[PDB]
Nucleic acid binder design. Structure first.
Ligand code: MG
Ligand code: MG
Ligand code: MG
Lengths: 72, 66, 93, 110
RNA sequence: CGAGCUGGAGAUACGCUUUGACUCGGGGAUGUCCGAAUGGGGAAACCCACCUCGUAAGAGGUAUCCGCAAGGAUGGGAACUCAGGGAACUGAAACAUCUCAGUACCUGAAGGAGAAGAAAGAGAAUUCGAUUCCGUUAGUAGCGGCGAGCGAACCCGGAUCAGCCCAAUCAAGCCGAAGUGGCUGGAAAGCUACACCUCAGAAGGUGAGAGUCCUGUAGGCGAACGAGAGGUCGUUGUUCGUGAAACGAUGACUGAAUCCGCGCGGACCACCGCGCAAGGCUAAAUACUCCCAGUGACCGAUAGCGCAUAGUACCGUGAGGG
RNA sequence: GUAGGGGAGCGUUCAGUCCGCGGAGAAGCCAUACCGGAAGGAGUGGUGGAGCCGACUGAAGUGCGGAUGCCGGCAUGAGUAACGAUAAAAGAAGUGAGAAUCUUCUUCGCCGUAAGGACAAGGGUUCCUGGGGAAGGGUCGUCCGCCCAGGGAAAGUCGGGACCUAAGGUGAGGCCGAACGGCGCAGCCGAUGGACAGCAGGUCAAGAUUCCUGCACCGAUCAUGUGGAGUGAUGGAGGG
């Protein structure tokens, strides 16, 4: 989980074959289709006073610049 | 028993009108077990009294302070 | 107070033939720690107690009716006053 | 088991009134009410009688034979009567006991 | 409310009832122990403490989370609602796509309803104009190992119909018309002969079949006081399974403008056109049904709920079955 | 004339409507040599004790011997095999409506590291007394571990708790996690282990280091005296 917004939770992953032909081969034969997820990272930050909290890149980025309610 | 001649008394008397019945209510309860309880109702009555002997007392607990 | 708690006198014969020696026994309440009870009695019959002894007791009966039974649970208690024998007269019963 | 509700645990009379057993046996017979069991629709009126044998086993010197007792009935008797014949009830009001209401038929008493 | 009552129990004894019991309505007061359970422990209903108020008996506080503070939260709800996670059997006469399905199940949150909602919309008329629900359009457009099979929306009819705000009568209950004789019978409300009521001939009961015996019904009354941003990669949703495939969505990298400004109108461009996103709250029509009343070309005891009552007996270590 | 197609009808419930029927007696049951082309229908009698035929039309959980079908009742095997260790039993006497089978006596036989005795766990009242005599007891039963009622269980020191800790459990504040949740120091719970004050007898029908009798020990609180001064932690060490 992250600072500004939750995150994690993701969706399926496909893998076809016959992949790409004359402007089109015959087509795309899918051979996969399953399921995955994606997470992030963190570094100690803190508001009100000291803390640590999980901090997502896109957050540590946006926060590294103009601070929003929370301070790097 | 219940009318303005029940509350009529002292809070302590209420107790006296309590701690005395359950003193009868005992000797009664004994009798029974010992066989001779010929006042089955007495029990229920004496009991019913104690009820009142508190409900009232309790009615005061809000009238004179809210 | 005092008059509270006790539940009734233990009739039976042993109890009775236990009385002839100034040992009175009656049924107190299940929850009634040996002290409270020691107290109560004293102040209901006016008298001390040199010794006390108490233990719990189950019930489960019936006559019939597919209604089996069910315990009823009691707590006989047995006391012993000081040489100043007797209690009221609810002894010589 | 339903029971005496079809009516409405309401005895169209008092355990003291006089009544005529209309319908059933003992038609027209009359007597003072004695037991008014509203719930069950039971009425004990000196009218009907029975001679029952008391089941008195080791009942301190048995000698049990056959008593004469009254056996209760239902709405098989029409409460109160004044024209000497059964009568509905309708014209009430009050007395010096406006603290109450009466009843009456063609006539007006009870 | 007016003779009875003393629970089912069918029994005896004691008794209680006009200074109107009982019973029915409607508020209070009591409400041991366990249970979110929360003084601490705990193999539920037990075992042990402490502080304060105190006649001692006895009273009360002693949990964690938000908040100065009031005050709010933890739990429990048959089904209905949304959300996070999400099968397989099965079909395709095999099978990996696809189908079965985002169903079943798990979990979180909530209410009596929810969800949704006031346009960077849908549509091709320079039209409509929040959301939702029923009809239809249509099994049309389309999706599809273009196989099995899956399947819209606009328009139009109808339920109902609001947009507002930020940031820069139902319950208790009371009153309530009108018949007798004779006959059959164990008993008549049946037969028979005369009679009555009818804004009450709905219904149940009464020794067999009841307008006029009882309870009722039509109709009338009826209370202290009680309710009502763009993109690239990976993927995905909508008919959208990669296809020329838009748009929406987001995990990862990036990263704009602002009126001679911005988005979209299914790649893409111009032209034409509709709308102004990154803040929010919102009745109502919608769903279900533990509970209640009414009804039934529904059952009437191997039927009907499992139960004319029992989740009991009985079976299982248990979930559970019954 | 088999699979199959087509035709006309019988019967069962429920519903609407018509004609009715019934306590001097409905439905259902039972018997029968009648009737109709069948499915089926009627008459009469018996039973029964309250609802019920016939006709037209409508709707059906609508018609049975089969499914190792389902529930229930009753048969066959048949009075057959069994009566659950080959540690035997005999007599007398007693009770009783009735006893091989109960009680008493006197013998016999079997176990005796047990088939004796004391606990644990587990079960609960099964214990004792008086009654009982359906069913249970593989047979009798006057008896029972069965049925009914009453009684019985007594602890400052025995076990446990108000003390301790092991595995393990839990766990403020901490580390992780789609949810639920997963881990986790101190602390806490946690015996099966540690620690800790009594013995000898008597004796209810039925209890005993619990009650009584004799004598004892431990802690606590107070008073008295002695004393005449420190007392000594959630910490250290020793020890357990
Ligand atoms: Mg039957
Ligand atoms: Mg039930
Ligand atoms: Mg068969």
């Amino acid at each position: 989980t992250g600072k500004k917004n939750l995150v994690v939770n993701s969706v399926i992953r496909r893998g076809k074959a016959r992949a790409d032909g004359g402007v089109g081969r015959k087509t795309t034969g899918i051979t996969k289709r399953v399921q995955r997820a994606n997470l992030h990272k963190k570094a100690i930050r803190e508001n009100g006073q000291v803390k640590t909290v999980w901090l997502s890149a896109n957050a540590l980025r946006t926060l590294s610049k103009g601070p929003y309610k929370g301070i790097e | 028993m219940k009318p303005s001649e029940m509350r009529n008394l002292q809070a302590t008397d209420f107790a006296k009108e309590i701690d005395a019945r359950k003193k009868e209510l005992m000797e009664l309860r004994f009798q029974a077990a010992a066989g001779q309880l010929a006042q089955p109702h007495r029990v229920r009555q004496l009991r019913r009294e104690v009820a009142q002997l508190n409900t009232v007392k309790a009615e005061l607990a809000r009238k004179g302070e809210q | 107070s005092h008059y509270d708690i006790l539940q009734a006198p233990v009739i039976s014969e042993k109890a009775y033939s236990a009385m002839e020696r100034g040992v009175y026994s009656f049924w107190v309440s299940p929850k009634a720690t040996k002290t409270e009870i020691k107290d109560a009695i004293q102040q209901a019959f006016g008298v001390r107690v040199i010794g006390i002894s108490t233990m719990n007791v189950p019930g489960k009966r019936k006559r019939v009716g597919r209604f089996i039974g069910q315990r009823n649970d009691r707590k006989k208690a047995i006391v012993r006053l000081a040489e100043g024998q007797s209690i009221e007269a609810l002894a010589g019963q | 088991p339903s029971a005496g509700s079809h009516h409405n645990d309401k005895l169209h009379f008092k355990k003291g009134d006089t009544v005529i057993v209309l319908s059933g046996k003992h038609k027209g017979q009359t007597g003072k009410v004695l037991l008014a069991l509203p719930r069950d629709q039971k009425v004990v009126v000196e009218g009907v009688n029975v001679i029952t044998k008391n089941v008195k086993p080791s009942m301190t010197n048995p000698q049990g034979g056959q008593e004469q007792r009254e056996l209760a009935l239902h709405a098989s008797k029409v409460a109160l009567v004044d024209p000497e014949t059964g009568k509905a009830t309708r014209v009430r009001k009050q007395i010096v006991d406006g603290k109450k209401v009466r009843v009456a038929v063609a006539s007006g008493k009870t």
